[PDB]
Ligand binder design. Structure first.
Ligand SMILES: Nc1ncnc2c1ncn2[C@@H]1O[C@H](COP(=O)(O)OP(=O)(O)O)[C@@H](O)[C@H]1O
Ligand SMILES: [Mg+2]
Length: 278
C-alpha cells in the first residue's frame, strides 16, 4: 500500500521517538544558567497534574536560604511530587516555581540541577570502586575531595577497613556494603557535589538504634546550612524543622513550626497525639 494524506509525510524516526517512556522537559531557547545566590525557594500558587484529580492545588510556600522545610501528611498527598517539581522532573500547569527570584522553567535544566543535591529513599550503587561511586556526586572531583566527602559522611573509616580501601569494588559484582554504608555513600555523593539546595526523601525503613542515630546526624550535617525540603517520615526531622507543611490531597492544610502546629490543635496535633499514645 501507498500511505496517503498526512501519513505520506510522517517521519517514522519521529514516531519511534514519541513512543519513548519518560517524555520530558525542554530548556526554553536561549535559557542561560541559573544565577544561584543563596538558594531561596519559592512556590507561588503551584498547580500540577499527572493525569485527568489535580495532584497539587494552589501550593504556595517559601524556603529561606539555609532553612529546612519538612513535608508531612498522608500517603498520596503530594509530598514527593513537590520535590520532583523543584527538580523540574515535570513542568507545572500553572503558578510559578522560583530559585533566587528566577523561574526554574526558564534556566537550563543542567544548571538548575547542578545546585540541587537529591538524597533519595534508596541509593543506587554502581558496579565500580567505592571512590568512583562517591565521585558520581561530581565526576571531575579530585581524590582528595572524595576522601573529604567520605570523611564528612562518616564512611572513611569503614572504607579504610575494606581490602582495597577506596579501590574496593562495590555494587552487584563487588563487596557488599551494609545498609548503613550504602546510605552514607549517598551522603558522601551529596557532600561532594556541594549543592546549595538539598531535596531529601527520607527512607521508610530504619536501621538499628545506634546506626539510625548516626545516619540521622550525618544527614543533619549535610543539610545544616543548605536550603532543604525533606519528605519527612522521622518524628525527629519534623520536631527540628524550620517549617512544616501538612499536605492533604494536594493542598497545604496547615503549616508552621512543630510547637506552633501542636498548639494549633488541628491535624498535625492529631497526628502527634496519636503517635504519643498518652
Ligand atoms: N508517576 C506518576 N504517574 C501518575 N500518578 C502519580 C505518579 N506518581 C505519583 N502519582 C500520584 O500522585 C499523587 C501524589 O503522590 P506522591 O507525590 O508520591 O505523594 P506522597 O509523597 O505524599 O506519598 C498520588 O495520588 C500518586 O498516586
Ligand atoms: Mg508517600
Amino acid at each position: 500500500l501507498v500511505p496517503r494524506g498526512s501519513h505520506m509525510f510522517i517521519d517514522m524516526e519521529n514516531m519511534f521517538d514519541l513512543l519513548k517512556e519518560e517524555t520530558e522537559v525542554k530548556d526554553l531557547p536561549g535559557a542561560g544558567p541559573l544565577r544561584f545566590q543563596k538558594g531561596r525557594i519559592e512556590f507561588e500558587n503551584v498547580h500540577f497534574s499527572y493525569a485527568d484529580r489535580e495532584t497539587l492545588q494552589d501550593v504556595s510556600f517559601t524556603v529561606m536560604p539555609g532553612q529546612t522545610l519538612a513535608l508531612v501528611g498522608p500517603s498520596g498527598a503530594g509530598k514527593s511530587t513537590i520535590l520532583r517539581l523543584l527538580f523540574r522532573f515535570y513542568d507545572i500547569s500553572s503558578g510559578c516555581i522560583r530559585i533566587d527570584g528566577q523561574d526554574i522553567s526558564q534556566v537550563t535544566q543542567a544548571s538548575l540541577r547542578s545546585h540541587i543535591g537529591v538524597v533519595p529513599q534508596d541509593t543506587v550503587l554502581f558496579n565500580d570502586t567505592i571512590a568512583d561511586n562517591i565521585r558520581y556526586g561530581r565526576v571531575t572531583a579530585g581524590n582528595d575531595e572524595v576522601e573529604a566527602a567520605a570523611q564528612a559522611a562518616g564512611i572513611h573509616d569503614a572504607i579504610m577497613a575494606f581490602p582495597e580501601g577506596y579501590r574496593t569494588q562495590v555494587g552487584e559484582r563487588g563487596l557488599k556494603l551494609s545498609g548503613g554504608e550504602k546510605q552514607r555513600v549517598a551522603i558522601a555523593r551529596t557532600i561532594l557535589k556541594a549543592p546549595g539546595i538539598i531535596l531529601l526523601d527520607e527512607a521508610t525503613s530504619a536501621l538499628d538504634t545506634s546506626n539510625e542515630r548516626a545516619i540521622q546526624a550525618s544527614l543533619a550535617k549535610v543539610c545544616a546550612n543548605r536550603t532543604t525540603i525533606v519528605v519527612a517520615h522521622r518524628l525527629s526531622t519534623v520536631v527540628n524543622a524550620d517549617q512544616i507543611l501538612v499536605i492533604k490531597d494536594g493542598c497545604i492544610v496547615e503549616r508552621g513550626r512543630h510547637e506552633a502546629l501542636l498548639s494549633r490543635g488541628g491535624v498535625y496535633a492529631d497526628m502527634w497525639q496519636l503517635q504519643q499514645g498518652q
